[PDB]
Amino acid sequence: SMNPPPPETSNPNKPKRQTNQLQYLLRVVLKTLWKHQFAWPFQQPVDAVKLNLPDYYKIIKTPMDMGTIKKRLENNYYWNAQECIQDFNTMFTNCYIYNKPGDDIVLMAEALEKLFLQKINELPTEE
Ligand SMILES: COc1ccccc1Oc1nccc(-c2c(-c3ccc(F)cc3)ncn2C2CCNCC2)n1
Ligand SMILES: [Cl-]
Numbered sequence: 001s002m003n004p005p006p007p008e009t010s011n012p013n014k015p016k017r018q019t020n021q022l023q024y025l026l027r028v029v030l031k032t033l034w035k036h037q038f039a040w041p042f043q044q045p046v047d048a049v050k051l052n053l054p055d056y057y058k059i060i061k062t063p064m065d066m067g068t069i070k071k072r073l074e075n076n077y078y079w080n081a082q083e084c085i086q087d088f089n090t091m092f093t094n095c096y097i098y099n100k101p102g103d104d105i106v107l108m109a110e111a112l113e114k115l116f117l118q119k120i121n122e123l124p125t126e127e
Contacts, residue, residue, distance in 0.1 A: 001054045006045045007064060009071035014079075020124045021081035026073040029088075029119045034066060036115060038108035042066050042091060059098055064091040081123065088116055 033039060044067040048056035057063070064087050071077070078084045095109040 001048065001057065003045065003047060003049050004057055004063065007068045009068055009077060010075040011077065014077065016076035017079060018076060019081065020127055022073065022076075022078060022084065024124055025081060025084045026070070029116065030066065030070055030073060032119060033112055033116060034070070036112055038111050039066070041105060041108065042095075042112060056098065060094045062090055063094060064088075066091065081126075085120060092116075 034043065042065055045063060045065050046053070046056055046060075048054070066088075069084065069087050069091070072087065073084065092109050092113045095105060099106050
């Protein structure tokens with residue numbers, strides 16, 4: 001089945017702001033996750049056509065990936081850090097819903113998620 005368009009990453013009509021926490025989410029969290037050895041399947045939308053997963057977008061109706069998150073952060077798409085954190089969590093959750101526990105892709109997600117949680121533990125206070 002066709003892939004859907006990727007998630008919106010820029011909205012001219014949606015107010016913008018920079019905060020310490022959003023800067024940290026881009027320059028620390030996204031950066032560190034991106035460089036992880038297991039990051040590659042998470043760096044762009046799931047290409048269900050290429051991967052021959054005709055049921056992927058029948059099951060997953062709230063897709064997310066780190067390529068989209070990088071753009072949202074760069075485009076100052078988020079008003080607050082919680083919106084961005086939610087996107088990371090959605091990305092991991094989708095992986096867990098579609099796949100079986102113990103599958104390689106799930107172990108990979110779990111490694112990134114642990115790293116993610118470690119980094120959000122050190123989220124700066126919104127000074
Ligand atoms: C470990 O990745 C792969 C393994 C074998 C073949 C291709 C692979 O690449 C890949 N790229 C993007 C997504 C996925 C993926 C996701 C996926 C990845 C990220 C995400 F956020 C959500 C789902 N869920 C399942 N898969 C594959 C499908 C083929 N059989 C092995 C798992 N795999
Ligand atoms: Cl596996």
